[PDB]
């Protein structure tokens, strides 16, 4: 705290309480007693625990019928209108679309829709796999997920 | 028909004014004005000027005859206290309080 390290009054003689510092955390505009620091909240997860969790929740999306597998999912031109038409034809609103390839027109046509997210097969995460209502996998992305996850 | 008059921020203590205000509660206004005329307190000058304002407001703004009027409610509230520092001996300072008031006179027939 910006201040001075001088006693605001003497130790004794006055009728007031003992005090040693104006920066005291019991004063107005004093310090915080346990002031925080920039700390890292990252946890370690073991690799076999991360894969056990992904293999668990992909089994649960199968058992809950929240997983859709198609051969191909392409958009001709990078238009969100085309993507919304295709997802309306698929009867999908809240969806994660994981594709084993890099589709730029699909990334651009899905970038503005908050209901829709598009991932690479490497970039899948459990919290997205839960936060989205349906998950659409390319069959190649299935082959890659099965290969990473043994 | 009730008619209100207020002297907010009356530069006087509320305790000193309530002595005067307790004399005319429930009285006819001709009697209250004679009491305030021959009362020697400063608060009688204040509360008389307020009672005269309440009478003139009842006659002008509300259409009421003065002889039937009667002081039904009167009360003095504590106002904001401006505060001054008065120096004392041996370097000690005292903070005097300079009280204010809010005089309120409600006058009516009933």
């Amino acid at each position: 705290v910006t201040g001075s390290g001088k006693k605001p009054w003497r130790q004794k003689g006055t009728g007031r309480a003992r005090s040693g510092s104006i920066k005291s955390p019991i004063w107005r505009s004093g310090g915080v007693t346990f002031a925080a620091r920039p700390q890292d909240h990252s946890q370690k997860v073991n690799k076999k625990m991360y894969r056990g969790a992904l293999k668990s929740i992909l089994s649960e999306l199968v058992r809950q019928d929240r997983l859709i597998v198609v051969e191909k999912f392409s958009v001709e031109a990078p238009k969100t209108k085309l993507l919304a038409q295709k997802l309306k034809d698929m009867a999908l609103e809240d969806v994660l679309i994981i594709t084993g390839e890099l589709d730029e027109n699909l990334f651009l046509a899905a970038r503005n829709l908050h209901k829709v997210d598009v991932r690479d097969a490497t970039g899948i995460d459990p919290v997205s796999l839960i936060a989205f209502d349906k998950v659409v996998m390319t069959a190649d992305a299935v082959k890659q997920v099965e290969e990473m996850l043994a | 028909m009730e008619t209100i008059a207020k002297h907010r921020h009356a530069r006087s203590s509320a305790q000193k004014v309530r002595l005067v205000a307790d004399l005319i509660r429930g009285k006819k206004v001709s009697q209250a004005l004679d009491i305030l005329t021959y009362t020697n307190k400063k608060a009688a000058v204040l509360v008389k000027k307020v009672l005269e304002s309440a009478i003139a407001n009842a006659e002008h703004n509300d259409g009421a005859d003065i002889d039937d009027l009667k002081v039904t409610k009167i009360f003095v509230d504590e106002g904001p206290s401006m505060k001054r520092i008065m120096p004392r001996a041996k370097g000690r300072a005292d903070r005097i309080l300079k009280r204010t008031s809010h005089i309120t006179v409600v006058v009516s027939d009933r």
Binding site: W9, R10, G13, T14, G15, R16 | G91, R92, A93, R95
Partner: peptide, 27 residues
């Protein structure tokens, strides 16, 4: 002078080193 007024408590206890009206020190 609202500065002096804000800070008056600091010094109305100006000298406060005086007392000892007990000549019989209780010794």
């Amino acid at each position: 002078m609202s500065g002096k007024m804000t800070g008056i408590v600091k010094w109305f206890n100006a000298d406060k080193g005086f007392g000892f009206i007990t000549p019989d020190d209780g010794s």
